């Protein structure tokens, strides 16, 4: 009844897709390589027509959503907020919803090494992905 503008985030927009976890974003009028933040990539590379029922699918989708997303939005972590390679350890998002919550609630990818000072959605992806493994949607 006074103020409800908590908090503050960064839209971004998609320069171009690297493959899953890794895409190129619109950051300060430059092309930076981002990276879903806390979450598991296929760790794959182009096999053949079969082996590894994953892959193609949860890089497409990463993708999916931010290209079909008119507008996405990244959020930095708490501690590094970059690695070695200075890669964009922040969360994905396409239309207003967490791209990585997608992959990690949907299946396609899984929630791993994260801590503090980061823990940005540590309690949002922590559901996700244990809500999903108990379950083993997709890819499980």
């Known amino acids: 009844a006074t103020s409800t503008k908590k908090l503050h985030k960064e839209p971004a927009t998609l320069i171009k897709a690297i493959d899953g976890d890794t895409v190129k974003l619109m950051y300060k009028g430059q092309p930076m ?41 990244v959020e930095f972590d708490k501690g590094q907020r970059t ?6 350890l922040a969360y994905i998002y396409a239309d207003g919803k967490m791209v990585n919550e ?28 244990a809500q999903a493994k108990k379950e083993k949607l997709n890819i499980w």
């Open 33 to 73: 390589t981002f990276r879903l933040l806390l979450v598991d990539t296929p760790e794959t590379k182009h096999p053949k027509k079969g082996v590894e029922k994953y892959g193609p699918e949860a890089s497409a989708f990463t993708k999916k959503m931010v290209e079909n997303a008119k507008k996405i939005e």
């Open 83 to 88: 690695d070695k390679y200075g890669r964009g």
């Open 102 to 129: 997608a992959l990690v609630r949907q299946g396609l990818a899984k929630v791993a090494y994260v801590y503090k000072p980061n823990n940005t959605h540590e309690q949002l992806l922590r559901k996700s992905e």
